[PDB]
Write a protein that binds this DNA or RNA. Structure first.
Ligand code: MG
Ligand code: MG
Ligand code: MG
Length: 1368
RNA sequence: GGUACCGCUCCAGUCGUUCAUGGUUUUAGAGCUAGAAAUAGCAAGUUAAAAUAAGGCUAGUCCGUUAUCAACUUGAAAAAGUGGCACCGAGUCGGUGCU
DNA sequence: ACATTTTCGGGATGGTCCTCATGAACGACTGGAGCGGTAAT
DNA sequence: ATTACCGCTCCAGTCGTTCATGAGGACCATCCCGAAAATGT
């Protein structure tokens, strides 16, 4: 039947709630038949409920997981690449090479050959370190070599240089020399002075290198050079030439008075090509400055990162490492002698003992630099003869470990320098190197471009390449085995802007000539004209529109009325007296691409010919899509009759970026099957007036409605996956939608297959801020301003600040944190906010908060060092109280603060701390825009109507901004921190409001999403806003819109509270929709109503199998070895083995001295690994695990979050492999929840209206609730742990801390509401007492536990029999 | 009562392609004196190489950090489908009656 | 030949330690706010 | 041929209303209970 009920849902990050409301009854109570045992007659449940689920790894964590797979694969392949080059050659000349490489692993008993790494004999193996203290000395030896080295030490050096290959970040050949840098600074100044004799720049003996070497910002380095070298300004020619060498992108358009942009950069191979175009126009005499600037940048890079001069060695990189390496042993020997003489007593302790981060732990362990320096620093300060040792601490030159990240970030080019020498020196000793050098230099330089990508032998979705035959895919003989044109085309067809009306096609480039013609013809259509014979204004015809485009738009970019009157009408149409109307003095439309083409080609033969426009569109499409300049050449070859050799060489520079929103097919590729005309044909000439482009597509007058029916009306298939394959990358939103559509689909089916009137859905994010804009940013300012006014200042009253200044995050971070960082407490300033770096609190991590409160403005992040130990402990000690002052002024959040105290308490959500100090944040919830569309797509899959457009199922998305007044009316305090049954009541209220809104049409409407400010009437009494505080509208007064439409209460009066009468008309037919004598009482009755239908989702664990590390520290049976036959005691197994689910089977395992069979059912964990054969054949699996004698009907599978109910009155849940989870819902009176929230609230706040007056008096008169709460808790311990254990400590603490602040105790009490959750046995700090951490191994009372299998939808429940359990 | 398609700009989030290092595991790594011996002290310390998700298609110079995955019936199998209401009440969800 | 004392072994339990992440060159999307376009009956 | 049925304002710019909402497992130290053997009667 048509309409009987409505449903509502509330979608969170890791939970979905729902509720069903029906006109015929007020009690959401319904029965189901018990499956299996039938322990209860017919179990009833509440229709209001919620589903809990695990959210998984979000955005940047998913990013890191795919990156991590490709990450080591690259390093592994590079090691394998050079191995394939030399291994076979070494095996051919040395028979003993092969066996040593193969027998390098495993125990003696399985080993067939001795290791002998370098020489081939134990006697000679330990002769190496006598001349070579490190790999870097062998590198110097081979680079400066005059003699022959063994192929094992040659491969040893070459293998180091491909494992330690270095980064190919910047394109082009950089100068590997540091011989005479000083000269380059003098020659640039003198060359400028010779070319510009009007105002010479004076060097004045200034050392420019000293300014650049110092750790200053790029802006400050430029400024200091301009201040010390007089003759030119920071924004002048010389300043922009310095900026280029600083690695910036200057634009010399304003410098050479150019009509077009002239940006230069040193990061691209085409820079030399751009200089050829530039010098062709400004002349040869300016070449020296740009070539010297390029070479100086190369010289400065090596000077800064190596700090070693050339010619004393041809290996300055290896030499740079050696100097410090030797100094480490000399400084350590010195300090060791000083400690022996001054501190005999602590001599063993200082060097041997890991616990304080000493020398032994530092060398053999992973001890932090800052902790190591911290320990030895006051020791060196107290000791005599340590002056030089104290300097090395500040320089960071004291005992730095050779292998560390800071010594790893080396570029590919300086590595090629030394490698070219390693190969060249040995060419007259090994002739094989002369032939292999070509292949070696290529793989050392090699990098995969976008248009080639994956070179996979097999067939798969992401295999873009077409392979010719079974040979190779290596760059060697590349064109003979694969075609980069085929991979470039398949790459572009998959990755580019796509047409949203054509699923398999793509849009035109933004430089399309057709795209530009479309806008010009629209403006020409608006034009009316008057002539010498024509009496009244008439519109332009198609031939006249074409004539104006052919004449005026092809001779000047923009057209004006004078041009039409003096040129077009007098020349083409031959009228002296004419007039143009419909437009002003000029048009908005213009041709941009057309005149750009004339300037580059400089001809007219490619213009007016009918076929040439299609030729130019194909060429611009190619120029936008492909950087590959040989692909551009091949496009130009088919049209070579229009393009000579010079223009084709000039075009080889760069891409025409950006696309339009329409493809060509729609515009002039689809013809009307009755008139024969395209949309472009109708645009040029048709009937009176026009409509919007999408309106003309939908228009019933054209035959394009058929194309809509064949494409759009068809829709997606039966499978849900196909409908949720769009919207959101978040696994939290994805799973929320996945379960939401399933719940809605099932609710409509089980409700007698009747259709709901409304489906009301909410979906939100962890919004930490408003977005950029004066409708958003302007309010973010208030969060800063309150902190400023709390601290105190006269600045805000003395001088007003314009609202357009503070619009972005970087300007907000400065005033939120003040002029100081949050890690080392060093100075920040306004002029340095775009010059200093910004960090994330938890980058590339499991969960990420929505925007500005997840980030922090810092000075340098090098202190992070991939560790969880803040090196600025002493800073945290004073800043912790400062950070609490910031939370009190609401400048930083509770989660932001707690991430800096993690070591003391771990995790556990405290997110809505704002609730007692200020909650002000109106959320947009942009995700909700397409949620209804995905559901609507499945729900209204029916076409039994003659284009009636009548929907049967209406899905409505709701904003939570309307719920606030309903929380007040029904006295709801719903912070999830004190209630994990949160979504159940939200979804109910959502169904109430969304249904309420449609029963009588709204009195005050607003525009789509944006709404309020867009359309409103001018009122002077809201104009005082902008002048005083800034723009404001109904977004602030949204509560008054609710009062206008419903008239529920009067908010203009304090004291006695009176509201709208109990029995009032609410429907469009004059009927009563909601009744306060029945409905209102029922809503508040549901709040405390027993047995709400809430469950943790049933599944089994898939994905995330293990972490890429080995833990030989573990040795239990659950450890999965890295290789099957390798001993876990030596070579270990993989970090964190993942169990998909468990199976309950009677054991065949023998116990004790008599070897008795365990004839009782036991838990066997099924791993994601072993599952792969278990599901296919469980018999062989069970026999291998010790469960040999078993029958099919005796095997019971236990999925993830399986439930148990004990006959002794307890409820429990299964984790994964057999571990015990808490379970059991919380039955507790509502009088405790309201008290604790309000008790903290009314600490420093006083009441006034009737309700607030009684709430304050309630907390003040009734302080006995804390004593009743510990009494209720002592009765829940008995249902979980049995013994009270630590509640004697908690009761003692509750009697002890009665003289402590009400708020500060209520701030952490939220951790005791874990009783509502089915897991989370949390440990936390209360006030001065920190509670013990416990976990549940298993249930002793096995035979009393009944196995429960429930549906994910929360409907039917299966109870499994106890007669099969056994026991002997 | 009674609108549709968007231009220009700035900022943010979602992210993708590409490349490198280190943490860490493992093997080779020639010592002296006292004491039955456990055990202790001193001489003495300078390095290199290999490797890092089970498992497997298309059996790889390749892919893999995932969802439905409970009872029940039909289907070789892939795959698909069914889940009662009137009527009263609410401290660990019960009852009258029909189906 | 049987019961008690005796030592060694297993399970339930809690305390402490363990954890593969960094980012710029090059390049694109949705999406919102403020400056706006164009109007009929 | 028209633009809120309702938001009609204060000796002054004020803080505040609601929400997305919680790391556990392995190894080692330890106490209590149970089985087979040696000894006494
Ligand atoms: Mg919500
Ligand atoms: Mg950072
Ligand atoms: Mg909610």
């Amino acid at each position: 039947m048509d309409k009987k009920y409505s449903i509502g849902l509330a979608i969170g990050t890791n939970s979905v709630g729902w509720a069903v409301i029906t006109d015929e009854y007020k009690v959401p109570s319904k029965k189901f038949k018990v499956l299996g045992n039938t322990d209860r007659h017919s179990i009833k449940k509440n229709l209001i409920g919620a589903l809990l689920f695990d959210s998984g790894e979000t955005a940047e964590a998913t990013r890191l997981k795919r990156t991590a797979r490709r990450r080591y694969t690259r390093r592994k392949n590079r090691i394998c690449y050079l191995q394939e080059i030399f291994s076979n050659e070494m095996a051919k000349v040395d028979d003993s090479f092969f066996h040593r490489l193969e027998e390098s692993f495993l125990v003696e008993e399985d080993k067939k050959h001795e290791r002998h790494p370098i020489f081939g004999n134990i006697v000679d193996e330990v002769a190496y370190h006598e001349k070579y203290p490190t790999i870097y000395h062998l590198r110097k030896k081979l680079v400066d070599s005059t003699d022959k080295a063994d192929l094992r030490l040659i491969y040893l050096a070459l293998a180091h240089m491909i494992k330690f290959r270095g980064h190919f970040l910047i394109e082009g050949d950089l100068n590997p020399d540091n011989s005479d840098v000083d000269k380059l600074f003098i020659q640039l100044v003198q060359t400028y002075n010779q070319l510009f004799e009007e105002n010479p720049i004076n060097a004045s003996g200034v050392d420019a290198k000293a300014i650049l070497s110092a750790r200053l910002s790029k802006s400050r380095r430029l400024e200091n050079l301009i201040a010390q070298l007089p003759g030119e300004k920071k924004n002048g020619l010389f300043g922009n030439l310095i900026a280029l060498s600083l690695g910036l992108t200057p634009n010399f358009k304003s410098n050479f008075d150019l009509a077009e942009d002239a940006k230069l950069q040193l990061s691209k191979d085409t820079y030399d090509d751009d200089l050829d175009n530039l010098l062709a126009q400004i002349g040869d005499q300016y070449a020296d400055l740009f070539l010297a600037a390029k070479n100086l940048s190369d010289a400065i890079l090596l000077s800064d990162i190596l700090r070693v001069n050339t010619e004393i060695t041809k290996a300055p990189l290896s030499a740079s490492m050696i100097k410090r390496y030797d100094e480490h042993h000399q400084d350590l020997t010195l300090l060791k002698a000083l400690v022996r003489q001054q501190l005999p007593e602590k001599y063993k302790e200082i060097f041997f003992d890991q616990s304080k981060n000493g020398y032994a732990g530092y060398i053999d362990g992973g001890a932090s630099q800052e902790e190591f320096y911290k320990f030895i620093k006051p020791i060196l300060e107290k000791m005599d003869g340590t002056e030089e040792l104290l300097v090395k601490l500040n320089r960071e030159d004291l005992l730095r470990k050779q292998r560390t990240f800071d010594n790893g970030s080396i570029p590919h080019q300086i590595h090629l320098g030394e490698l070219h020498a390693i190969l060249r020196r040995q060419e007259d000793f090994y002739p094989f190197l002369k032939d292999n050098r070509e292949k070696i230099e290529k793989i050392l330089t090699f990098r995969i471009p976008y248009y080639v990508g994956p070179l996979a032998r097999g067939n798969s979705r992401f295999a873009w390449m077409t392979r010719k035959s079974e040979e190779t895919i290596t760059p060697w003989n590349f064109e003979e085995v694969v075609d980069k044109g085929a991979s470039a085309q398949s790459f572009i067809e998959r990755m580019t802007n796509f047409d949203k009306n054509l699923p398999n096609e793509k849009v035109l480039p933004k430089h399309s000539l057709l795209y530009e013609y479309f806008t010009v013809y629209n403006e020409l259509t608006k034009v009316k004209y008057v002539t010498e014979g024509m009496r009244k204004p008439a519109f332009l015809s198609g031939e006249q529109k074409k004539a104006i485009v052919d004449l005026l738009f092809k001779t000047n970019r923009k057209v004006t009325v004078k041009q039409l009157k003096e040129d077009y009408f007098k020349k083409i149409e031959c009228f002296d007296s004419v007039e143009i109307s419909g437009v002003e003095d000029r048009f908005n439309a213009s041709l941009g691409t057309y005149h750009d083409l004339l300037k580059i080609i400089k001809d007219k033969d490619f213009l007016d010919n009918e076929e040439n426009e299609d030729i130019l569109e194909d060429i611009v499409l190619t120029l936008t899509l492909f950087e590959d300049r040989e692909m551009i050449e091949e496009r130009l070859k088919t049209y070579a009759h229009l393009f000579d050799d010079k223009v084709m060489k000039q075009l080889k520079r760069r891409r025409y970026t950006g696309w339009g929103r329409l493809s060509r097919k729609l515009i002039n590729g689809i013809r009307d099957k009755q008139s024969g005309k395209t949309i472009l044909d109708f645009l040029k000439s048709d009937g009176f007036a026009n409509r919007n482009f999408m309106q003309l597509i939908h228009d019933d007058s054209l035959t394009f409605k058929e194309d809509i029916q064949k494409a759009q009306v068809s829709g997606q298939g039966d499978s849900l996956h196909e409908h949720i394959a769009n919207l959101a990358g978040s696994p939290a939103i994805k799973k929320g939608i996945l379960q939401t559509v399933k719940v809605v689909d099932e609710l409509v089916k089980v409700m007698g297959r009747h259709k709901p009137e409304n489906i009301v859905i909410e979906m939100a994010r962890e919004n930490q801020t408003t977005q950029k804009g004066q409708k958003n940013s302007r309010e973010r300012m208030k969060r800063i301003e309150e902190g400023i006014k709390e601290l105190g200042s006269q600045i805000l009253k003395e001088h007003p600040v314009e609202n357009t200044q503070l619009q972005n995050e970087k300007l907000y971070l400065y005033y939120l944190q003040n002029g100081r960082d949050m890690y080392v407490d060093q100075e920040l300033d306004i002029n340095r906010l775009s010059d200093y770096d910004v960090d994330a609190i938890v980058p590339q991590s499991f969960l990420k908060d929505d925007s500005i409160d997840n980030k922090v403005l810092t000075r340098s992040d090098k202190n992070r060092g991939k560790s969880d130990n803040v090196p600025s402990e002493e800073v945290v000690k004073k800043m912790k109280n400062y950070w609490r002052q910031l939370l009190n002024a609401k400048l930083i959040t509770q989660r932001k603060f707690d991430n800096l105290t993690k070591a003391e308490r771990g995790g556990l959500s405290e997110l809505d701390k704002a609730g007692f100090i200020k909650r002000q944040l109106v959320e947009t919830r942009q995700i909700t825009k397409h949620v209804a569309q995905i559901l609507d797509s499945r729900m209204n899959t029916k076409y039994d109507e003659n284009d009636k457009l009548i929907r049967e199922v209406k899905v409505i998305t709701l904003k939570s901004k309307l719920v606030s007044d309903f929380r007040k009316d029904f006295q709801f305090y719903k912070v999830r921190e004190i209630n994990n049954y949160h979504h159940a009541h939200d979804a109910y209220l959502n169904a109430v409001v969304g249904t309420a809104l449609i029963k009588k049409y709204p009195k005050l409407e607003s525009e789509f999403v944006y709404g309020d400010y867009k359309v409103y009437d001018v009122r002077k009494m809201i104009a005082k806003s902008e002048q005083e505080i800034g723009k404001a509208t109904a977004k602030y007064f949204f509560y008054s819109n609710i009062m206008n439409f419903f008239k529920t209460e009067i908010t203009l009066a304090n004291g006695e509270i009176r509201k709208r009468p109990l029995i009032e008309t609410n429907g469009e037919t004059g009927e009563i929709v909601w009744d306060k004598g029945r409905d209102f009482a029922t809503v508040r009755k549901v709040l405390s109503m027993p047995q709400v239908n809430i469950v943790k989702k049933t599944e089994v664990q898939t994905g995330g199998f293990s972490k890429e590390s080995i833990l030989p520290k573990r040795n239990s049976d659950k450890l999965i070895a890295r290789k099957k036959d390798w001993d876990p005691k030596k070579y270990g197994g993989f970090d964190s083995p993942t169990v998909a689910y468990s199976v309950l089977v009677v054991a065949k395992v023998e116990k004790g001295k008599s070897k008795k069979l365990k004839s009782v059912k036991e838990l066997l964990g099924i791993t994601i690994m072993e599952r792969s054969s278990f599901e296919k054949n469980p018999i062989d699996f069970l026999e291998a695990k010790g469960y040999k004698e078993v029958k099919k009907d005796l095997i019971i599978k236990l999925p993830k979050y399986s439930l148990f109910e004990l006959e002794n009155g307890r409820k429990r849940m299964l984790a994964s492999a057999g571990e015990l989870q808490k379970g059991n819902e919380l039955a507790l009176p509502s009088k405790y929840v309201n008290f604790l929230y309000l008790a903290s609230h009314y600490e420093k706040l006083k009441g006034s209206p009737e309700d607030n007056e009684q709430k304050q008096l309630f907390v003040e008169q009734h302080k006995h609730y804390l004593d009743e709460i510990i009494e209720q808790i002592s009765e829940f311990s008995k249902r979980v742990i049995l013994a009270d254990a630590n509640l004697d400590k908690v009761l003692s603490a509750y009697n002890k801390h009665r003289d402590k602040p009400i708020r500060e105790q209520a701030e952490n009490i939220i951790h005791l509401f874990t009783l509502t959750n089915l897991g989370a046995p949390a440990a936390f700090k209360y006030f001065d007492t920190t509670i013990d951490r416990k976990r549940y191994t298993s249930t002793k009372e096995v035979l009393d536990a009944t196995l429960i299998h429930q549906s994910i939808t929360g409907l039917y429940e299966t109870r499994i029999d106890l007669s099969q359990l056994g026991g002997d």
